[PDB]
Structures are given as C-alpha cells and as structure tokens.
A and B are shown apart, each in its own frame.
Chain A
Amino acid sequence: AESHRLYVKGKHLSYQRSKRVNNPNVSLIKIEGVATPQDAQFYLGKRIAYVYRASKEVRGSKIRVMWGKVTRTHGNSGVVRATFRNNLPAKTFGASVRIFLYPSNI
C-alpha cells in the first residue's frame, strides 16, 4: 500500500526531573493516542527506538538507532517512563521516536 508503519509515533518530552534537578537515566515519552494511564498500561514493556542519521557510514548504513523500553506510566495523562541502553542526548526534546508492538500480549 502507501503506508507501511508498524509502530506508534511518540515524542521525547524531557528527562525525569524535579523543579531544578533532572535525571537523564529516565526519559519521558508522550505516546500519541493515549490520554490516560489505563490506556497507557497497554504499552508497558514495549520496545522504543530512536532513529537518527549521521554523515559517516559505519557498518553499511548512515542511520543509527538507540534502543529502550517502556517501564511505567507517568502522571495522569498517558505520558510514560522509558529507559534506554544509552540515555537520550537531550537535544532530542520534542523529537519523534518509535514505539513497537513487540513484545506483544495479543
């Protein structure tokens, strides 16, 4: 067809933070479509990929991926907490990111 998307779009909002101290080890993700923790409970444990590009070709590609997963819900509005192998570079606040449907329970 014309669409081939097998993931859900999301936005990298910020790190986990207090009013004046942030914590880069936990990122905050807005998954689009979900507006409550009860709907966000479907997406727990799903893999997340941040997909970006670079000028230098490394192993056949100019596209590099950072992997992570959803761990828990955050707040009352469907924001989730996500942890990555290496933390997200904080210039990606507001950048798009992919939530895959695996590991599936359905």
Chain B
Amino acid sequence: VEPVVVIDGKGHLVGRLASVVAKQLLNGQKIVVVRAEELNISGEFFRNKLKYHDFLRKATAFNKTRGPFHFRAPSRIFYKALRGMVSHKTARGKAALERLKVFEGIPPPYDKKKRVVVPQALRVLRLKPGRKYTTLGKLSTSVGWKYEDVVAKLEAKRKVSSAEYYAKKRAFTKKVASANATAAESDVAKQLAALGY
C-alpha cells in the first residue's frame, strides 16, 4: 500500500515486531525502523542481561575473530532478531534484507516523514499490566553501547523542532476547521451530508 513504511520502534516488543517486519520484507514491503533504542523486551532487566551474557560467552575457540559476532547497538540487536527469522543465507533472503534499514533515533531523511505503529506488537496492548519489561537502550548500554547520551541529546533537539512544527500545524488546522464549519450548512453541504460526506 505504501512505498516505504516508517515504523516508530518506541514501546514495541522485539520478537513480535521482528516477526511482523520479516514477513513484510519477504512479501516485498520496504520498511525503515526508527528509534530502535526504545524497544521493549518482556522480562526483568537482570534476566535479559543474563541472556545477553550467555550469548556473549559463545565464540569460536581456535579463533575468536570468525566466531558469532555480538553486536552491541540496539538496532543491530533488532537486526539479529530479524535475521533469525529471515532465511538470510539465500538470494531471496539477501534481497529481503536489503529492503530494511534500522536506526537509533530518527535521522534527517525520516524526521519529516510519518511514523506508524504495529498494534499487535505494542507493549501496552500485549503485556498484562504488572509484568516487568526492559528498555533496549538501557540493556545495550549496559552491555557495551557507547552512544546512549548523544542519541538522547539529538532526540531532545529533534523533539524541540518537532514541537515548533506542530504548533504551526495545529494553528493552521484550527483555521481550516473554523472555515469548514462556517462554510457548512449551505446547500452543497446539505447535499454532501445527504450523500454521506
């Protein structure tokens, strides 16, 4: 339905979002995921830190350089979870994976575009209230990501600029709604209301 779909990754569950997105890429939809530092994983922070340490133990014994690579950024953690669900070793899998780019924060190509959510992977809609969850940015900076604060500063600046945008947009839409209400109850308005618009 869309050329590119921009997904705001905030408040989403990692596995459910990855299983949605992998099927979208295999069907041929182009997906870009922004704000990867705000993904959520169900479970305690200590459980997921222990899980990452169990993953971090695994390496090739005779040469660590050819072993499993333990990527530390939240976007690369999401990429790992998604590459697990795409059959990446085939040409179809590579062609699917080249339709995806995942980012921490919202870069300047996508800060002026529209962000969507996936309601079947949202934490507030999936988890029972009371279950504990993690933040992927906190887990990733606990296991070695170096750029948690610069992303926070850039996101603060971007949010200031976006609020400055939204004030003007709200004023303009209030003018347009006022003019539409005053130009209603004419004959064309009543004919459109009879016809359903």
Contact = CB atoms under 8 A, between A and B. Distances in A.
6 shortest A-B CB distances, which residue pairs? Answer: A94-B28, A11-B27, A94-B27, A11-B28, A93-B92, A13-B27
Secondary structure at the B interface, as helix, strand, loop or mixed, is helix
Interface of B: 1, 26-28, 92, 96
Interface in A7-49: 11, 13, 30, 32
Nearest to A12: B28
Nearest to B92: A93
14 contacts: A11-B27, A11-B28, A13-B27, A30-B27, A32-B1, A93-B26, A93-B28, A93-B92, A94-B26, A94-B27, A94-B28, A94-B96, A95-B28, A96-B28
Interface in A81-95: 93-95
Interface residues of A, number: 8
Contacts of A13: 27
Contacts of A32: 1
Contacts of A96: 28
